[PDB]
Nucleic acid binder design. Structure first.
Lengths: 78, 136, 80, 83
RNA sequence: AUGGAGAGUUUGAUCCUGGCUCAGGAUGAACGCUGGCGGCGUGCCUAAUACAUGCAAGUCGAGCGAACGUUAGCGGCGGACGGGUGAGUAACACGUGGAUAACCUACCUAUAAGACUGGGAUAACUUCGGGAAACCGUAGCUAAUACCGGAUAAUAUAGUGAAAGACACUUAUAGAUGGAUCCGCGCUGCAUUAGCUAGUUGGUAAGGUAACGGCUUACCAAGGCAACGAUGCAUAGCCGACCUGAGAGGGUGAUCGGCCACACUGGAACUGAGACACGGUCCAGACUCCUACGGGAGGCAGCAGUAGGGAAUCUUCCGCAAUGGGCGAAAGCCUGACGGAGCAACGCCGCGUGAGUGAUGAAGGUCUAUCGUAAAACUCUGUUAUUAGGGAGAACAUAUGUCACAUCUUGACGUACCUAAUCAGAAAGCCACGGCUAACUACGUGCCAGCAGCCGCGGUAAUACGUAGGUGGCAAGCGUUAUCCGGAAUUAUUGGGCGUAAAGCGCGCGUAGGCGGUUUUUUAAGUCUGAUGUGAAAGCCCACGGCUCAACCGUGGAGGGUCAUUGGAAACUGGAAAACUUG
């Protein structure tokens, strides 16, 4: 009956996770999709997501060892 | 008495069946199938009175009871004592099992037991076929 | 706390190292006490090598690194 | 998260208790691994305070502090304030 | 190893048997009886029923946008909640050790990178509005240690966020929490279910969960099986508990659950300091239903109570005070977690309802001296009952001054121990009524009713019955209710027949294997047994101490049961070289 504040913090939790995961959905739509296709996406177009996925993964929900698997397949993928 | 084939092939115990199989049971209507209960206490509600004559070993005369238990089957009783309850249609405390010398009946009456009290011609019994408040 | 030297023998195999080793032990039942010997089957694997027609070996209990197979050890007796 | 617990088998006639390291989200009763003993807070049964909390006082730098009004028993002692 | 004497069972009979009825109890054991009271305890065990509702973890800030931190809900919480269990699975759901070459993380405690720079939006005040309400539309909002650029933050060997009251913020990092990524033995029955599933054998994937990897997919060959239980498959918790054995333990594991399956329903976009969420969030169902029919969504596997099914199957007596979860720099909460109890003579006990008794004592009740040392009418105990004062435990707290910690801060039940003078304030009533199961004789009774725990009784002396004064056991107790225990030696792990109870090969045949020459044996595993590890138990093969003794707690020397090390005795089932031969 204290849903009178957590009927709805599930939903700000939603928005504040999903819009940023989607702003990653555009961060996997540039570099990882085009570190093959020969495009310019291996310099500063990989490095935006350094501090961007860093805007993501300083909190307990975002990937942790999967963070070490998403950074080892984009920066070490030379 | 050799133990190799004893874990290959085992043995049995004796072979016995327990007492009053159509007793200690309360018949369903919602789910239609009986309950294996062995209840302490139970009721009896009456369908007839009943009596058969040919008695060799005693060779006196005394009747019994034909009381049906739940929901369409033959259940039969007997009144062991000198008290005649010229009654029926009762709601009682069952006594489980058969007394000596009547085959197939396993259902009985406790003294008192919410329907009547008992054959009131008894005052010395103080503990047989109806006997309450008896000076000891 | 280390990892044992489980051993055994081999029975058969299929394409490209569907390998195995036999498992058995000395022990009895709790009821009627006879020294009847007993077994159960295992799952090791090689490149193609530890296999049928004679592979008396050892096996392990480690990280499998396997499909549902479990072992990495082959410490032998001999071959045929 | 760690809290105090106690055992239960059959007596009282004087407020009794015990010393242990159970979970936080739980009642007074809890499971004890390294049994240290018990405690008698009835001010009458002095021969029952044979608690040898050797792994219960090692939470000083691990994770512990007087809570649930139980500092009175730790008031007589002083094996803390090491930091 | 504190070791096993049961009632009667054969034909007609000693005799070898043969197990039954049966025992005593113990059961969440109570029903008529009987209902002096209680120490303390448990009872939708009738139906894991449909519902008289609500009921439930909850409120707030010298850090923040209304008023003389009130009035927010941002932020934090909650939400997976306490509790309810044993409806649902042969399953790592369950007790213990455990590779981590399958694991990590803020709540308990210290902190530490620092506390720089930011924009500005959203709850409330709702700002503006249609219309049964309230459901919904416009819609700037005003802030927040915050919705929130950017510096390096750590694993390039090259990843970002901090907006501290006052003499409290965000990170490189941690000890930790449920767990467990998982290993192992824990991990039951149905042979009216073997020619084996196409993935059976296992290697080979872009993938990914704090977690290897047929786990979906990645590539190819099956005889992988194979007469050994492939597989199907039926109840489907385990584990300190209880009656209990001499001991192996052997079963039920309900008061008592420490662990897990489970909250109308199929899901569920969601999420979390811990997910598909018992009064959440939506959309399919059938329910007592609420609604200008906006359409509401609710069901006490969480206290009650209603129609109930009812062997019994309970108090809606009270409300935080015995613990603080959460909110809070703080004073404070909610308890429906835990508490306060009609108490059912359900457990059995603490003991109390008669005394100094009394000459044999009567007016005599089975018998015709018996229970009569029956009686009276005298006295003895407080303990039931007229009152009374009733304070059993115990230590609570920024500013009081400077996590060891504390005062001007702890009586609903807070009245118990109640000696208390104390009259006399009865302890219902016992069975069969012979002998075994332990019992005493008879008039009623003439086979008319009829006695009867296996044995067993009335037809004219029921040493049974109808009934009547009681001896064997008894006084909170009479007959019955039915569950496994030693007893049942009618499992045979200790404790099983062969021609004969109730039992032996149609046999020439005969796979698997239970067994499977003599001697030395190569083995150096195991037993011989053991250094060790000696890692805790409340209590253990024991005893004891607190307690008006009984309801309610505790020292653990018995090492926690090859658990953290593998052994020396080859006398051998055991990596197994032969010789002997007449069998």
């Amino acid at each position: 009956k204290s849903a009178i504040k957590r009927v709805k913090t599930t939903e700000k939790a939603e928005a504040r996770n999903i819009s940023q995961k989607s702003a990653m959905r555009t961060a996997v739509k540039n570099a990882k999709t085009a570190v093959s296709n020969n495009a310019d996406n291996k310099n500063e177009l990989v490095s935006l997501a350094v501090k961007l996925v860093d805007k993501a993964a300083q909190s307990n929900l975002i990937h942790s060892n999967k963070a070490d698997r998403i950074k080892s397949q984009l920066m070490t993928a030379n | 008495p050799t133990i190799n084939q004893l874990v290959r092939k085992p043995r049995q115990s004796k072979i016995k069946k327990s007492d009053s199989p159509a007793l200690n049971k309360g018949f369903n209507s919602k789910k239609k199938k009986f309950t294996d209960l062995n209840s302490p206490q139970k009721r009896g509600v009456c369908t007839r009175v009943g009596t058969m004559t040919p008695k060799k070993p005693n060779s006196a005369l005394r009747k019994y009871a034909r009381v049906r238990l739940s929901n369409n089957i033959e259940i039969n009783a007997y009144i062991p004592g000198i008290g005649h309850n010229l009654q029926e249609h009762s709601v009682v405390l069952v006594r489980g099992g058969r007394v000596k010398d009547l085959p197939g009946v396993r259902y009985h009456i406790v003294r008192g037991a919410l329907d009547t009290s008992g054959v009131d011609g008894r005052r010395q019994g103080r503990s047989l076929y109806g006997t309450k408040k008896p000076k000891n | 706390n280390d990892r044992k030297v489980y051993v055994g023998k081999v029975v058969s195999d299929k394409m490209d190292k569907t390998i195995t080793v036999l498992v058995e032990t000395y022990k009895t039942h709790k009821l009627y006490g006879k020294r009847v010997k007993y077994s159960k089957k295992y799952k090791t694997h090689d490149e193609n090598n530890s296999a049928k027609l004679g592979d008396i070996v050892k096996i392990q209990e480690t990280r499998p690194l396997s499909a549902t197979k479990r072992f990495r050890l082959v410490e032998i007796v001999e071959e045929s | 998260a760690v809290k105090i617990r106690l055992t239960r088998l059959g007596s009282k006639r004087n407020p009794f208790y015990r010393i242990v390291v159970a979970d936080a989200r739980s009642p007074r009763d809890g499971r004890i691994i390294e049994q240290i003993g018990t405690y008698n807070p009835t001010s009458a049964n002095a021969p029952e305070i044979k608690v040898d909390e050797a792994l219960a006082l090692k939470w000083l730098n691990d994770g512990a502090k007087p809570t649930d009004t139980v500092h009175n028993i730790l008031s007589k002692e002083g094996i803390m304030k090491k930091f």
